[PDB]
Amino acid sequence: ARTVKLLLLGAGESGKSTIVKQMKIIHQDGYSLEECLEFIAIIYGNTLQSILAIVRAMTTLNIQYGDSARQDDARKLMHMADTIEEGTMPKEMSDIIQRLWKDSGIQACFDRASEYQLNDSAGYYLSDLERLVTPGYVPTEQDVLRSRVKTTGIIETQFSFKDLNFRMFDVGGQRSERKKWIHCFEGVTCIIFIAALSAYDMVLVEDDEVNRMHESLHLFNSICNHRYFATTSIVLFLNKKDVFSEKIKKAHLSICFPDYNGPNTYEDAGNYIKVQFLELNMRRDVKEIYSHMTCATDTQNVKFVFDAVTDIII
Ligand SMILES: Nc1nc2c(ncn2[C@@H]2O[C@H](COP(=O)(O)OP(=O)(O)O)[C@@H](O)[C@H]2O)c(=O)[nH]1
Ligand SMILES: [Mg+2]
């Protein structure tokens, strides 16, 4: 059969690894019991880092607890975080986290997550902590999809679909991904560029002067117009449409694009962002780039979108 080398490109946290997990669920055979048990430590670490970030932001943003009794809980939490074996979640810690999560001050801070770059799965895990710490708990595929682990190795995802043999690789532009650049850009059949729609109101951890969507736009410009990819199929995934639909109700898109004069609705603000990316294609009138609004954690959405990508490839 024909071999298809497909690259998933995009800024950190855009959704590359999530699409890779979806390929395993959709085109391979999901996760076995033992593979799900693997994710418990990762999920606990993810959960602890999420609450610690919200707690530190209480100080940074100067928000006070709805209940002063929480201040001691926060202190004990920080202390335990330095004491527990990494990846564990003892009863005392989970009890403290649940009390903090319920606090109105903590919730006011959670609502201001954009201001401190909180990972998107924070609310997912934290609002369902009791299920995660029940003796007998086995991560569901959605739990696994929502997780984030630091993978230093090169992971090739191979699967057959529509009589094509896919060899898929997820690659970032950050320096730690350099070993992948030695060969990842050779003989690429298709590039799926992923950009988080919800990145529009966020700045970088280091450069508070640099907007994340602008960084993604900058990378797309570099890739899209590179001579290596003049005839490569390129598809744009405007990811995190679910987070975006909520964000759009509170932060105006003009925060990112001063020229934006629209009503800030999911559809119009979404199309405006799509245009900002697609207009960068200087090969546009010659080489067309399709785009899809995606929710990488939604298996049905990813299944449909990847099917369209495959028909494009064919
Ligand atoms: N709500 C929501 N979360 C998402 C979506 N796509 C990815 N995530 C989560 O966002 C985080 C960053 O995604 P990840 O795939 O690790 O990004 P990467 O650095 O590009 O590989 C993970 O915790 C994902 O579960 C999405 O469409 N919606
Ligand atoms: Mg990743």
From Swiss-Prot:
The source organism is: Bos taurus (Bovine)
List keywords of the entry alphabetically: Cell projection, GTP-binding, Lipoprotein, Magnesium, Membrane, Metal-binding, Myristate, Nucleotide-binding, Phosphoprotein, Sensory transduction, Transducer, Vision
Q: Give start and end of each G-alpha domain.
A: 2-314
Tissue and organ expression note: Rod.
Per its UniProt record, what CDD domains does this chain match?
G-alpha
Keyword Membrane assigned to the entry: answer is yes
Question: Function, please?
Answer: Functions as a signal transducer for the rod photoreceptor RHO. Required for normal RHO-mediated light perception by the retina. Guanine nucleotide-binding proteins (G proteins) function as transducers downstream of G protein-coupled receptors (GPCRs), such as the photoreceptor RHO. The alpha chain contains the guanine nucleotide binding site and alternates between an active, GTP-bound state and an inactive, GDP-bound state. Activated RHO promotes GDP release and GTP binding. Signaling is mediated via downstream effector proteins, such as cGMP-phosphodiesterase.
Q: What is this protein called?
A: Guanine nucleotide-binding protein G(t) subunit alpha-1
Q: Where is this region: G1 motif?
A: 5-18
- Please list where the region (G2 motif) is annotated: 143-151
User: InterPro entries under this entry?
Assistant: Gprotein_alpha_I, Gprotein_alpha_su, GproteinA_insert, P-loop_NTPase
Gene3D superfamilies per UniProt:
GI Alpha 1, domain 2-like, P-loop containing nucleotide triphosphate hydrolases
Region annotation (G3 motif) maps to 166-175
> SUPFAM superfamilies recorded for this chain?
P-loop containing nucleoside triphosphate hydrolases (SSF52540), Transducin (alpha subunit), insertion domain (SSF47895)
A molecular function (GO) held by this record is: protein kinase binding
Pfam families in alphabetical order: G-alpha
Q: Where in the cell is it found?
A: Cell projection, Cilium, Photoreceptor outer segment; Membrane; Photoreceptor inner segment
Q: Where does Mg(2+) bind?
A: 17, 151
Transmembrane regions: none
Chain sites annotated for binding GTP:
10-17, 120, 145-151, 173, 239-242, 296
This protein's source sits in the domain of life called Eukaryota
Positions carrying Phosphotyrosine are 116
What's its membrane topology?
Peripheral membrane protein
Please give the chief subcellular localization of this protein.
other
Using the UniProt annotation, give all residue ranges assigned to the region (G4 motif): 235-242
